[PDB]
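Section: Multi-chain targets

For targets with more than one molecule, the full set of components is provided together so that the structure can be written out for the assembly as a whole rather than chain by chain. Components appear in the order listed by the source. The example entry contains two components.
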Amino acid sequence: MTYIQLLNETLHCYASKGSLEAYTYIMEHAKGIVGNEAQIYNFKYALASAAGLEEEAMHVMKEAIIEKGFWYGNEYLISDDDLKPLHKFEEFHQMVQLCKEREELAKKTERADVKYIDSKKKEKLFIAMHGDQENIAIVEPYWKSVLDQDYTLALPQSSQIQFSDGFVWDDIQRGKEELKEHYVKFIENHRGESVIIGGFSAGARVALYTILHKDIDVDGFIFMAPWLPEIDEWNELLEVLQDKNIKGYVVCGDQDEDCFECTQQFVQVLKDKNIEHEFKVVPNLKHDYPEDFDELLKEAIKYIEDKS
Amino acid sequence: MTYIQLLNETLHCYASKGSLEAYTYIMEHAKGIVGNEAQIYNFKYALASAAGLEEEAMHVMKEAIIEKGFWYGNEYLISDDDLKPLHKFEEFHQMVQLCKEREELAKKTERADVKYIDSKEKLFIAMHGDQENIAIVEPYWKSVLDQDYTLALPQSSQIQFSDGFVWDDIQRGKEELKEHYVKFIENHRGESVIIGGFSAGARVALYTILHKDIDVDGFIFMAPWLPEIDEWNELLEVLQDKNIKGYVVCGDQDEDCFECTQQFVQVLKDKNIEHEFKVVPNLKHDYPEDFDELLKEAIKYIED
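Its structure, encoded as tokens over all components, is:
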């Protein structure tokens, strides 16, 4: 029973039954209810006085005003009809005067006040992994549209350099390590909610390796022409996908001589291990992203965590 | 044509046609394409050399390495078959040596790097009812944080009794409401803004909006008390000017506010203002017990 329910039912009871019953009602139900005691006491002694329980009303009043130090309107005090039976008492005039004082003071001191309760800022993260012989400039354009879904985009670059501005994921260990380093650093000074990791070819490889070694907690993954040459060797580790409930959105073009094979073998295992996912083959496309890839990203994200 | 399309079609052309045609292909399509130039130059001179255009290849190489300062793998350089025709040239050994230096340096210096590209600041103002305060109203509007909204709970300066505040003088109310709001936006740029209220609280909220003292995207009233709804006929026009959505809720046992709330909803229909009224059965002058769920819908509706 909330403060308002108590107050509403009490009033109802005043009309329904007498002032006596309503007094009896609030006596029993007021206990424990938080809100504004002053208002609760006013109701109590007003009902007491109205019902004819003059003595009860006086000590209720005393407590409120004397013991708890609250105050009520002067006009109300000297004009509420329910309180007339109390004017006989001298203690009553004492309270009146005591309240008047507290009121005059309280009114000159009126002032606005406000309480702000700032939000936590649901920070979402998306990590995209470039392909071999790429870098951040080259992979950014294809994953830039994740900001439209309120996602902070992290684009990691491998330390394994092959030529000026060209980087690779050959050594999948350093990759997994770095990927963890970046991820740890990010959550340490944040600790976000949703996390989706995306990748292209070898990029997608390290992404999947990392996830499976539980080096990164992810809600879903979005691979584009992933290069997964040891898909059979990772049969045991793929279990991790069914014990943590992760959604996968995989895309690959049917003219991709290097990645349609491994991408379809991978999808086969995802079906065998009943992992919620969705594979999309784009006709005529080779080893490149589809021209309406930013639209697929919209679906993918919707699917991944928007849905559930 | 993207960097990848260029690179893929060029290779395709190498297999389809000769190394000469593929060279010719990349020459005309590379122009303008953004993306790793080093990789683009490698393709160019490698195809040149392979095709038999040794001289062209040399300048291509020179530019890339000399003029633009890029470098390539030593092993690749001294082992790619397509580049063998270049070993005759002394300038070629110069490049080799120049790259070896830049490579040794670059490889001892390998290091991870990452680029972050960050992605609002929303405000919600709830107005307590007469004879209430911040403690009493907070519980019914606390669930707006779940929708990424900063919650502002203003308290009227008009005190009636210990910890009991009222919106009698609807002018001071409008004033204060503006003061709080101004102060907040001067240091926040609040994108979305929704104002909510209960009874008299909702009244000041509406009065303020209409005097354009506060820009709001929507408003959520609970059992609003609007006694001069007809007197505000002219000022209600403002709701059709900047296009605001309204979500009004009221209980059918509310002796004091079901009248005015329905009259108000009537005007909103007459003035064709996007809105949605919801009557909760059996409810008196109090919030519905599943009110935090209605707030979810209301906000969904409003921002949509």
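The two ends of chain A are 34 Å apart (CA to CA).
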